[PDB]
Tab-separated table of C-alpha atoms in Angstrom:
chain	number	residue	atom	x	y	z
J	1	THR	CA	18.875	-24.196	-44.500
J	2	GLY	CA	20.000	-23.073	-41.114
J	3	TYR	CA	19.523	-19.366	-41.310
J	4	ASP	CA	16.902	-19.239	-38.411
J	5	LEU	CA	19.600	-20.231	-36.058
J	6	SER	CA	21.507	-16.341	-35.697
J	7	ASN	CA	20.571	-13.024	-35.542
J	8	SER	CA	20.705	-10.661	-38.355
J	9	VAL	CA	21.224	-13.255	-41.164
J	10	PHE	CA	19.318	-12.713	-44.069
J	11	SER	CA	17.585	-15.843	-45.316
J	12	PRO	CA	17.451	-16.046	-48.949
J	13	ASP	CA	13.564	-14.693	-48.518
J	14	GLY	CA	15.589	-11.596	-47.212
J	15	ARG	CA	14.175	-12.579	-43.820
J	16	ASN	CA	15.222	-12.327	-40.591
J	17	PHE	CA	13.634	-15.470	-38.976
J	18	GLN	CA	15.047	-14.379	-35.230
J	19	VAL	CA	13.175	-11.478	-35.490
J	20	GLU	CA	9.830	-12.880	-36.352
J	21	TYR	CA	10.379	-15.800	-33.826
J	22	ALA	CA	10.562	-12.809	-31.383
J	23	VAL	CA	7.354	-12.019	-32.789
J	24	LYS	CA	5.866	-15.546	-31.906
J	25	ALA	CA	7.197	-14.661	-28.000
J	26	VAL	CA	5.232	-11.256	-28.436
J	27	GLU	CA	1.613	-12.986	-29.964
J	28	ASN	CA	2.189	-15.065	-26.727
J	29	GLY	CA	1.587	-12.606	-24.576
J	30	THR	CA	-1.258	-10.668	-23.062
J	31	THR	CA	-3.052	-8.211	-24.628
J	32	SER	CA	-2.295	-4.810	-24.317
J	33	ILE	CA	-3.615	-2.037	-26.273
J	34	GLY	CA	-3.549	2.030	-26.942
J	35	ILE	CA	-6.428	4.517	-28.204
J	36	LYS	CA	-5.495	7.717	-29.562
J	37	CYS	CA	-8.189	10.676	-28.242
J	38	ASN	CA	-9.094	14.283	-29.082
J	39	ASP	CA	-6.270	15.977	-26.557
J	40	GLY	CA	-4.691	12.870	-25.348
J	41	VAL	CA	-3.745	9.151	-25.659
J	42	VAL	CA	-5.311	6.337	-23.092
J	43	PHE	CA	-3.288	3.381	-22.563
J	44	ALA	CA	-4.948	-0.028	-21.298
J	45	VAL	CA	-3.609	-3.918	-20.328
J	46	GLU	CA	-4.373	-7.324	-19.800
J	47	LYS	CA	-3.124	-8.564	-16.107
J	48	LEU	CA	-3.293	-12.575	-15.886
J	49	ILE	CA	-4.596	-13.436	-12.058
J	50	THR	CA	-2.279	-16.689	-12.284
J	51	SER	CA	-3.642	-17.195	-8.495
J	52	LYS	CA	-5.352	-15.713	-5.870
J	53	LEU	CA	-1.878	-15.546	-4.164
J	54	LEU	CA	-1.179	-12.775	-6.838
J	55	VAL	CA	-1.532	-8.490	-4.612
J	56	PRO	CA	-4.325	-6.996	-6.635
J	57	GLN	CA	-3.124	-3.625	-7.505
J	58	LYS	CA	0.687	-4.153	-7.065
J	59	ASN	CA	2.303	-5.435	-10.042
J	60	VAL	CA	2.141	-2.854	-12.298
J	61	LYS	CA	3.217	-3.128	-15.872
J	62	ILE	CA	2.169	-0.199	-17.401
J	63	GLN	CA	5.848	2.161	-17.419
J	64	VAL	CA	6.090	6.178	-17.480
J	65	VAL	CA	9.270	8.079	-19.233
J	66	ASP	CA	9.950	11.324	-17.754
J	67	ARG	CA	6.427	12.662	-16.890
J	68	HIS	CA	4.684	13.155	-19.863
J	69	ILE	CA	5.126	9.757	-21.588
J	70	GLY	CA	3.494	6.530	-20.607
J	71	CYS	CA	4.701	3.006	-22.194
J	72	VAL	CA	2.615	-0.730	-22.357
J	73	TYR	CA	3.843	-3.833	-23.534
J	74	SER	CA	3.155	-7.114	-24.580
J	75	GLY	CA	5.617	-10.402	-24.695
J	76	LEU	CA	8.477	-10.732	-22.593
J	77	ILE	CA	8.173	-8.709	-19.588
J	78	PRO	CA	11.597	-8.065	-18.579
J	79	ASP	CA	12.535	-6.998	-22.164
J	80	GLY	CA	10.101	-4.195	-22.063
J	81	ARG	CA	11.751	-2.897	-18.642
J	82	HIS	CA	14.801	-2.991	-20.296
J	83	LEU	CA	13.679	-0.693	-23.336
J	84	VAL	CA	11.866	1.790	-20.667
J	85	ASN	CA	15.172	1.912	-18.875
J	86	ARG	CA	16.533	3.318	-22.590
J	87	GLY	CA	13.644	5.135	-22.695
J	88	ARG	CA	14.097	7.191	-19.690
J	89	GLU	CA	17.996	7.889	-20.425
J	90	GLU	CA	17.424	8.796	-23.808
J	91	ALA	CA	14.835	11.463	-22.310
J	92	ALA	CA	16.673	12.260	-19.653
J	93	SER	CA	19.620	13.590	-21.953
J	94	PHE	CA	17.388	15.054	-24.395
J	95	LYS	CA	15.918	17.190	-21.200
J	96	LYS	CA	19.749	17.990	-20.321
J	97	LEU	CA	20.833	19.401	-23.598
J	98	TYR	CA	17.577	20.440	-24.664
J	99	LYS	CA	16.060	21.749	-21.799
J	100	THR	CA	12.247	21.134	-23.887
J	101	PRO	CA	10.749	17.597	-22.687
J	102	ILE	CA	11.274	14.956	-25.367
J	103	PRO	CA	8.882	15.058	-27.927
J	104	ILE	CA	6.819	11.709	-28.528
J	105	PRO	CA	8.408	11.224	-32.166
J	106	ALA	CA	11.526	11.951	-31.347
J	107	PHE	CA	11.279	9.783	-28.435
J	108	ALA	CA	9.592	6.943	-30.717
J	109	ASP	CA	12.997	7.050	-32.510
J	110	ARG	CA	15.188	6.590	-29.810
J	111	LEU	CA	13.593	3.514	-28.923
J	112	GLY	CA	13.462	2.111	-32.674
J	113	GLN	CA	16.904	2.911	-33.604
J	114	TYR	CA	18.095	1.030	-30.105
J	115	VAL	CA	15.454	-1.782	-30.898
J	116	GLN	CA	16.161	-2.027	-34.550
J	117	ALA	CA	20.387	-1.867	-32.900
J	118	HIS	CA	19.076	-5.366	-31.923
J	119	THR	CA	18.792	-6.947	-35.427
J	120	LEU	CA	22.484	-5.975	-36.340
J	121	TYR	CA	24.335	-8.422	-34.407
J	122	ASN	CA	24.438	-11.983	-33.991
J	123	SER	CA	26.108	-11.183	-30.404
J	124	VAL	CA	22.502	-9.819	-29.335
J	125	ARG	CA	19.039	-11.043	-29.597
J	126	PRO	CA	15.984	-9.416	-30.323
J	127	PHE	CA	13.539	-8.167	-28.537
J	128	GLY	CA	10.540	-10.020	-27.488
J	129	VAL	CA	7.993	-7.234	-27.077
J	130	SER	CA	5.559	-5.083	-28.842
J	131	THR	CA	5.727	-1.908	-27.510
J	132	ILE	CA	2.445	0.579	-27.313
J	133	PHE	CA	3.405	4.146	-25.811
J	134	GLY	CA	2.781	7.651	-26.514
J	135	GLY	CA	1.603	10.824	-25.197
J	136	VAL	CA	0.844	14.648	-25.337
J	137	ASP	CA	3.837	17.366	-26.175
J	138	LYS	CA	3.996	20.812	-28.167
J	139	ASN	CA	2.390	19.368	-31.077
J	140	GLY	CA	-0.540	17.718	-29.500
J	141	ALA	CA	-1.354	13.785	-28.884
J	142	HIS	CA	0.729	10.961	-30.437
J	143	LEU	CA	0.250	7.257	-29.848
J	144	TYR	CA	2.999	4.747	-31.157
J	145	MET	CA	3.409	0.608	-31.396
J	146	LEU	CA	6.970	-0.441	-31.575
J	147	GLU	CA	7.870	-3.758	-32.557
J	148	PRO	CA	10.583	-6.015	-32.235
J	149	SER	CA	12.173	-5.922	-35.667
J	150	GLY	CA	12.599	-1.647	-34.724
J	151	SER	CA	9.456	-1.329	-36.908
J	152	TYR	CA	6.807	1.934	-35.750
J	153	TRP	CA	4.546	3.956	-36.930
J	154	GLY	CA	1.977	6.176	-35.638
J	155	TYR	CA	-1.474	5.064	-34.861
J	156	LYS	CA	-5.054	6.027	-34.143
J	157	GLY	CA	-5.573	2.586	-32.233
J	158	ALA	CA	-3.006	0.089	-31.466
J	159	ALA	CA	-3.237	-3.314	-29.920
J	160	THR	CA	-0.885	-6.433	-29.425
J	161	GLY	CA	-0.414	-9.365	-27.437
J	162	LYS	CA	-2.811	-12.617	-27.910
J	163	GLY	CA	-5.872	-11.086	-28.351
J	164	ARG	CA	-4.852	-8.526	-30.921
J	165	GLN	CA	-7.175	-9.262	-33.958
J	166	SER	CA	-10.281	-9.203	-31.734
J	167	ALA	CA	-8.571	-5.710	-30.239
J	168	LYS	CA	-8.176	-4.759	-33.888
J	169	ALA	CA	-11.234	-5.229	-34.522
J	170	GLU	CA	-12.976	-3.479	-31.659
J	171	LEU	CA	-11.038	-0.714	-32.198
J	172	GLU	CA	-11.417	-0.299	-36.182
J	173	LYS	CA	-15.410	0.070	-35.396
J	174	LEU	CA	-14.265	3.608	-32.739
J	175	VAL	CA	-12.320	4.934	-35.575
J	176	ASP	CA	-15.091	4.644	-38.275
J	177	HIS	CA	-17.660	5.580	-35.747
J	178	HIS	CA	-16.023	8.734	-34.378
J	179	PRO	CA	-14.121	10.381	-37.426
J	180	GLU	CA	-14.351	13.967	-35.696
J	181	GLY	CA	-12.842	12.393	-32.542
J	182	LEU	CA	-13.441	10.532	-29.483
J	183	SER	CA	-12.726	12.371	-26.073
J	184	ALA	CA	-10.253	11.464	-23.058
J	185	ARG	CA	-13.009	9.609	-20.385
J	186	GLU	CA	-14.544	8.386	-23.223
J	187	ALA	CA	-11.377	6.600	-24.603
J	188	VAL	CA	-10.691	4.829	-20.954
J	189	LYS	CA	-14.484	3.613	-20.856
J	190	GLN	CA	-13.884	2.386	-24.562
J	191	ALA	CA	-9.835	0.825	-23.341
J	192	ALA	CA	-11.567	-0.849	-20.486
J	193	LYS	CA	-14.701	-2.565	-22.801
J	194	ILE	CA	-11.942	-3.633	-25.549
J	195	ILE	CA	-9.389	-5.381	-22.808
J	196	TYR	CA	-12.614	-7.227	-21.789
J	197	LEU	CA	-13.582	-8.011	-25.113
J	198	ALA	CA	-10.124	-9.186	-25.756
J	199	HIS	CA	-10.445	-11.682	-22.714
J	200	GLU	CA	-12.148	-13.679	-24.477
J	201	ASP	CA	-8.746	-15.114	-26.517
J	202	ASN	CA	-7.565	-15.955	-22.751
J	203	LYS	CA	-10.303	-16.824	-20.550
J	204	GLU	CA	-9.276	-19.657	-18.674
J	205	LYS	CA	-7.659	-17.443	-16.346
J	206	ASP	CA	-9.905	-14.389	-15.064
J	207	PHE	CA	-7.972	-10.965	-14.976
J	208	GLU	CA	-6.999	-7.734	-13.582
J	209	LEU	CA	-8.169	-4.583	-15.754
J	210	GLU	CA	-5.159	-1.750	-15.559
J	211	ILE	CA	-5.587	1.686	-17.517
J	212	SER	CA	-3.526	4.797	-17.656
J	213	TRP	CA	-3.677	7.964	-20.005
J	214	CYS	CA	-2.303	11.616	-20.601
J	215	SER	CA	-4.287	14.011	-21.622
J	216	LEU	CA	-4.113	17.955	-22.613
J	217	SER	CA	-7.530	18.417	-20.315
J	218	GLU	CA	-7.753	15.768	-18.208
J	219	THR	CA	-4.717	15.413	-16.334
J	220	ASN	CA	-2.807	18.453	-17.539
J	221	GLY	CA	-0.332	16.902	-20.171
J	222	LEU	CA	1.319	14.641	-17.673
J	223	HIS	CA	0.888	10.732	-17.483
J	224	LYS	CA	-1.188	9.314	-14.648
J	225	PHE	CA	-3.048	5.929	-13.787
J	226	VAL	CA	-6.523	5.486	-13.750
J	227	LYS	CA	-7.548	4.118	-9.937
J	228	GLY	CA	-10.118	4.577	-7.874
J	229	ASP	CA	-13.903	5.715	-8.797
J	230	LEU	CA	-12.713	6.490	-12.573
J	231	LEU	CA	-11.439	2.961	-12.914
J	232	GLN	CA	-14.082	1.458	-11.608
J	233	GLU	CA	-16.641	2.849	-14.033
J	234	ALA	CA	-14.408	2.431	-16.560
J	235	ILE	CA	-14.935	-1.306	-15.207
J	236	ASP	CA	-18.977	-1.389	-14.783
J	237	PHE	CA	-18.890	-0.012	-18.709
J	238	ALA	CA	-17.153	-3.171	-19.447
J	239	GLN	CA	-19.098	-5.279	-17.634
J	240	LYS	CA	-22.657	-4.031	-19.195
J	241	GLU	CA	-21.059	-4.712	-22.528
J	242	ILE	CA	-20.022	-7.976	-22.601
J	243	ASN	CA	-23.645	-9.401	-21.250
B	1	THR	CA	39.146	25.207	-9.215
B	2	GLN	CA	36.245	27.592	-9.576
B	3	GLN	CA	35.383	31.245	-8.857
B	4	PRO	CA	31.933	32.305	-8.300
B	5	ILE	CA	30.558	34.879	-10.875
B	6	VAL	CA	26.678	35.837	-10.433
B	7	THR	CA	26.172	35.727	-7.094
B	8	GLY	CA	23.330	35.183	-4.651
B	9	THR	CA	23.628	35.963	-1.138
B	10	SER	CA	21.847	35.372	2.589
B	11	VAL	CA	19.525	32.373	3.163
B	12	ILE	CA	17.648	32.620	6.323
B	13	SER	CA	15.634	30.320	8.096
B	14	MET	CA	14.225	29.611	11.952
B	15	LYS	CA	11.764	26.380	12.964
B	16	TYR	CA	8.351	27.223	14.518
B	17	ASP	CA	5.923	25.061	16.319
B	18	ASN	CA	4.250	23.810	13.388
B	19	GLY	CA	7.193	24.201	10.593
B	20	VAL	CA	9.730	25.972	8.939
B	21	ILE	CA	10.202	29.441	7.412
B	22	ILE	CA	12.630	29.780	4.667
B	23	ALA	CA	13.695	33.596	3.053
B	24	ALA	CA	16.419	34.724	0.431
B	25	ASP	CA	16.372	37.729	-1.560
B	26	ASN	CA	15.734	38.408	-5.238
B	27	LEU	CA	19.153	39.506	-6.496
B	28	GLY	CA	21.818	37.413	-8.677
B	29	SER	CA	24.950	40.091	-7.967
B	30	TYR	CA	27.823	40.221	-10.814
B	31	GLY	CA	30.713	41.585	-8.124
B	32	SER	CA	29.505	44.772	-6.900
B	33	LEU	CA	27.005	45.108	-9.907
B	34	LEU	CA	23.431	44.522	-8.763
B	35	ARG	CA	22.846	42.571	-12.407
B	36	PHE	CA	19.758	40.641	-11.827
B	37	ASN	CA	16.377	41.383	-10.286
B	38	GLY	CA	14.086	38.707	-11.054
B	39	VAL	CA	16.086	35.841	-9.053
B	40	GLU	CA	14.042	33.306	-7.613
B	41	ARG	CA	16.873	31.595	-5.362
B	42	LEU	CA	13.765	29.543	-3.014
B	43	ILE	CA	12.605	26.093	-5.074
B	44	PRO	CA	10.278	24.052	-3.843
B	45	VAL	CA	10.594	20.307	-3.785
B	46	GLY	CA	7.079	18.402	-3.876
B	47	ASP	CA	4.678	19.715	-1.557
B	48	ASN	CA	6.545	19.269	1.623
B	49	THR	CA	10.376	20.699	0.864
B	50	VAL	CA	12.268	24.168	0.293
B	51	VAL	CA	15.573	24.327	-0.911
B	52	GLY	CA	16.956	27.518	-0.356
B	53	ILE	CA	20.652	28.503	-2.207
B	54	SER	CA	23.209	31.262	-2.025
B	55	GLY	CA	26.632	31.028	-3.945
B	56	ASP	CA	27.202	30.831	-7.537
B	57	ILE	CA	23.815	30.929	-9.632
B	58	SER	CA	25.421	28.937	-12.382
B	59	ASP	CA	25.859	26.386	-9.876
B	60	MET	CA	22.209	26.917	-8.357
B	61	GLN	CA	20.385	26.510	-11.985
B	62	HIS	CA	22.083	22.827	-12.296
B	63	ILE	CA	21.268	22.119	-8.756
B	64	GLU	CA	17.389	23.099	-9.705
B	65	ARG	CA	17.586	20.970	-12.322
B	66	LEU	CA	19.196	17.861	-10.515
B	67	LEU	CA	16.097	18.420	-7.982
B	68	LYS	CA	13.698	18.160	-10.751
B	69	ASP	CA	15.268	15.358	-12.083
B	70	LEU	CA	15.221	13.661	-8.730
B	71	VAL	CA	11.210	14.356	-8.608
B	72	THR	CA	10.471	12.336	-11.904
B	73	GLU	CA	12.865	9.625	-11.086
B	74	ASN	CA	11.174	9.444	-8.227
B	75	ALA	CA	7.689	8.763	-9.632
B	76	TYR	CA	9.044	5.648	-12.060
B	77	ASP	CA	7.356	2.945	-11.491
B	78	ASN	CA	6.276	4.503	-8.289
B	79	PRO	CA	2.591	3.768	-7.486
B	80	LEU	CA	2.971	5.362	-3.717
B	81	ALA	CA	4.736	8.836	-5.656
B	82	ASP	CA	2.381	11.095	-4.117
B	83	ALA	CA	1.995	9.067	-0.955
B	84	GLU	CA	4.003	7.218	1.237
B	85	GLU	CA	6.918	6.739	-1.189
B	86	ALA	CA	6.977	10.427	-1.898
B	87	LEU	CA	9.891	12.845	-1.332
B	88	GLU	CA	11.252	14.066	2.111
B	89	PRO	CA	12.899	16.851	3.219
B	90	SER	CA	15.748	14.282	4.354
B	91	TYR	CA	16.143	12.025	1.550
B	92	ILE	CA	17.035	15.372	-0.469
B	93	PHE	CA	19.294	16.819	1.600
B	94	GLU	CA	20.990	13.774	2.013
B	95	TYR	CA	21.035	13.227	-1.544
B	96	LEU	CA	22.578	17.233	-1.900
B	97	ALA	CA	24.754	16.645	0.882
B	98	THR	CA	26.491	13.517	-1.015
B	99	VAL	CA	26.830	15.584	-3.883
B	100	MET	CA	28.320	18.699	-2.356
B	101	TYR	CA	31.510	16.544	-0.544
B	102	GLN	CA	31.844	14.523	-3.684
B	103	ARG	CA	32.501	17.760	-5.873
B	104	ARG	CA	34.723	18.895	-2.959
B	105	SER	CA	36.470	15.739	-3.010
B	106	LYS	CA	36.928	16.284	-6.702
B	107	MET	CA	38.673	19.556	-6.625
B	108	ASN	CA	35.335	21.025	-8.250
B	109	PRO	CA	32.833	22.223	-5.711
B	110	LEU	CA	29.522	23.661	-6.468
B	111	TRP	CA	30.136	27.096	-5.092
B	112	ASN	CA	27.015	27.591	-2.965
B	113	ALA	CA	25.562	27.185	0.561
B	114	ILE	CA	22.346	25.253	0.991
B	115	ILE	CA	19.935	25.257	3.444
B	116	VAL	CA	16.696	22.770	3.079
B	117	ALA	CA	14.093	23.113	4.905
B	118	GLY	CA	10.674	21.115	5.261
B	119	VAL	CA	8.562	18.452	7.234
B	120	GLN	CA	8.935	15.330	7.508
B	121	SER	CA	6.082	12.721	6.980
B	122	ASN	CA	5.801	12.337	10.507
B	123	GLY	CA	5.311	16.107	11.309
B	124	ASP	CA	8.714	16.663	12.190
B	125	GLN	CA	10.746	20.248	11.350
B	126	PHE	CA	13.738	19.459	8.707
B	127	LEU	CA	16.062	21.940	8.788
B	128	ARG	CA	19.583	21.802	7.740
B	129	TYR	CA	22.379	23.645	6.019
B	130	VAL	CA	24.751	22.093	3.397
B	131	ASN	CA	27.877	23.742	1.685
B	132	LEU	CA	30.712	23.862	-1.179
B	133	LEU	CA	32.816	21.903	1.216
B	134	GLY	CA	30.094	19.488	2.037
B	135	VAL	CA	30.113	20.511	5.728
B	136	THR	CA	26.628	20.081	7.416
B	137	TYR	CA	24.660	21.429	10.563
B	138	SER	CA	21.443	21.725	11.674
B	139	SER	CA	20.006	23.696	14.475
B	140	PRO	CA	17.013	26.162	15.454
B	141	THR	CA	18.321	28.702	13.210
B	142	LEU	CA	20.148	28.520	9.985
B	143	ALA	CA	21.925	31.334	7.834
B	144	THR	CA	24.311	31.675	5.080
B	145	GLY	CA	26.553	34.370	4.072
B	146	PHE	CA	25.339	37.991	6.026
B	147	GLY	CA	22.799	36.580	7.518
B	148	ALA	CA	25.020	34.049	9.650
B	149	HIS	CA	26.288	37.181	11.257
B	150	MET	CA	23.428	39.332	11.319
B	151	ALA	CA	20.142	37.297	11.233
B	152	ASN	CA	21.349	34.427	13.597
B	153	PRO	CA	21.996	37.110	16.215
B	154	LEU	CA	18.307	38.001	15.844
B	155	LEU	CA	16.474	34.737	15.544
B	156	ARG	CA	18.396	33.357	18.166
B	157	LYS	CA	16.412	35.849	20.402
B	158	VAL	CA	12.779	34.353	19.446
B	159	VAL	CA	14.297	30.720	19.668
B	160	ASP	CA	17.523	30.340	21.323
B	161	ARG	CA	17.409	26.552	21.792
B	162	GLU	CA	15.181	22.915	21.006
B	163	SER	CA	12.820	23.940	23.816
B	164	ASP	CA	11.798	27.576	22.618
B	165	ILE	CA	10.550	25.781	19.413
B	166	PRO	CA	6.797	24.704	20.451
B	167	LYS	CA	6.527	28.352	21.739
B	168	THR	CA	7.074	29.783	19.080
B	169	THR	CA	3.955	30.537	16.592
B	170	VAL	CA	4.178	30.909	12.591
B	171	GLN	CA	3.714	34.636	13.394
B	172	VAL	CA	6.269	35.574	15.902
B	173	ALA	CA	8.384	33.760	13.382
B	174	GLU	CA	7.773	35.234	10.059
B	175	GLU	CA	8.058	38.758	11.739
B	176	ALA	CA	11.680	37.477	12.925
B	177	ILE	CA	12.416	36.782	9.525
B	178	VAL	CA	10.820	39.696	7.495
B	179	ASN	CA	12.913	42.232	10.477
B	180	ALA	CA	15.773	39.969	9.579
B	181	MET	CA	15.832	40.341	5.842
B	182	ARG	CA	15.056	44.485	6.686
B	183	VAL	CA	18.182	44.605	9.150
B	184	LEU	CA	20.399	42.505	5.715
B	185	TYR	CA	18.960	45.239	3.306
B	186	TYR	CA	20.496	47.760	5.781
B	187	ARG	CA	23.857	46.815	6.087
B	188	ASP	CA	24.416	43.851	3.506
B	189	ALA	CA	26.018	45.867	0.108
B	190	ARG	CA	25.062	42.918	-2.455
B	191	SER	CA	21.521	42.931	-1.100
B	192	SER	CA	17.931	43.347	-2.460
B	193	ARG	CA	15.128	45.295	-1.349
B	194	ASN	CA	12.840	42.480	-2.717
B	195	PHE	CA	12.700	38.909	-1.679
B	196	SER	CA	10.541	35.897	-1.476
B	197	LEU	CA	9.504	33.871	1.798
B	198	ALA	CA	8.584	30.123	2.165
B	199	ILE	CA	6.653	28.677	5.018
B	200	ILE	CA	6.324	24.848	5.250
B	201	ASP	CA	3.436	23.815	7.765
B	202	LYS	CA	2.437	20.567	8.856
B	203	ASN	CA	-1.271	21.671	8.974
B	204	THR	CA	-1.191	24.205	6.109
B	205	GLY	CA	1.284	22.944	4.002
B	206	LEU	CA	3.427	24.623	1.557
B	207	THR	CA	2.607	28.396	1.386
B	208	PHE	CA	5.238	30.228	-0.990
B	209	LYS	CA	4.741	34.046	-0.768
B	210	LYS	CA	6.725	36.287	-4.443
B	211	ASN	CA	7.790	39.702	-4.364
B	212	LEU	CA	8.017	40.639	-0.846
B	213	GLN	CA	9.295	44.254	-0.168
B	214	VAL	CA	11.867	45.278	2.776
B	215	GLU	CA	9.349	48.312	4.437
B	216	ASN	CA	8.829	49.868	7.905
B	217	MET	CA	12.390	51.385	7.280
B	218	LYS	CA	14.307	54.181	9.779
B	219	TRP	CA	16.197	56.723	7.500
B	220	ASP	CA	14.548	60.118	8.900
B	221	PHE	CA	17.530	60.562	11.253
B	222	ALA	CA	19.900	60.616	8.606
B	223	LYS	CA	19.102	64.135	7.677
B	224	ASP	CA	20.440	65.572	11.294
B	225	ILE	CA	24.085	63.578	10.431
B	226	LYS	CA	26.306	66.538	9.495
B	227	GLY	CA	29.847	65.913	8.640
B	228	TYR	CA	32.487	63.436	10.079
B	229	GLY	CA	33.267	65.311	13.096
B	230	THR	CA	33.872	69.007	13.643
B	231	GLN	CA	31.771	69.889	10.461
B	232	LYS	CA	28.270	72.134	12.008
B	233	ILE	CA	26.497	72.953	8.902
């Protein structure tokens, strides 16, 4: 055998074991989710409080690309940052040439082609992150989820990390119970709940909630972090549902 | 090595007790042809800075995009982007001042004279000049092009030195600026009647005024002027 020792090598199955091994690193990471809503998207993430010494609200994991796209990821955090740095270069060179801010499907493929490129050679390692991202453009709201292989799709709801199955199950219920659509302010509250429900799969260390959102009405189409009263309102909503 | 094509004339500005005023007409000249009349040559960066640009308009539009991209880049991984780590006038200027000098040193300048007017986070007035050569200076009054020759003399009658700044109110300062814009309309052949004016105050913030016009002009005496010397009729 030895087919798993080198990246970009096909096993006899037709699989790239190094990419599947990168997925294990993603599965090991903290939970992160994405919820598509009426006129925008909502992102949320589980931040494990390793120690009391961690400064609250000052280890931000969700990243903005351009002014209208939000990105969150699970797995190897530095790999996720590298991907976002690239996204920002891609978005900047798009706006530079075409004037208009980069559309979300266009942006999604820019990351996709870059991550896919890291499964083509043995001199690079695949990305150890699944990236949930999206935003609002001229065609409306879009939510995406990108994996180590370079595979990505459009999603109504997306989840990844150690509590992905718990989150997915809870996401599927929202899609069934809200066929006409979920509002932006509702999605923020739901996002909080789902992170709290998905925290049951990582319950040794207690955690810190972090939420962001793009919405054509609420945030004027721009990416903003959910802070202060709106954040505490969402936390209380989640606290009430677990009990 | 460039030559400017579509050009914008004077930018004028001055400090007053609580902030700064900056103004520039809405004309995009094409040599002697007064080609474009809806040009905005004052560009606000955030809610605390206004960059006034004269000279080549294509290079002005490039600078606009850099400032626009600077705001975006500052927001990245910055929870305090709208607070303590927001863009200051001094940051924005130094960036431009760097770019202008780097381009002149590569013998490929941005053919512009720029005045960055704003108010710092500590409440201090910021007003500084930079041009295509990368030459920088600061003064209670600053002006580009014809404004340097005609506006500055008038504005310096109000604020002649640093100690006159606390004595000058926003009403007086704005009146001098508007007066100067009229004088430039009389005498600058590449100026227009329509202009924009911006006030950055440490209390009331950024007030951006559009579609102003030069008015209260003296033209009546022209009827009495006949010929060029001896002619009586």
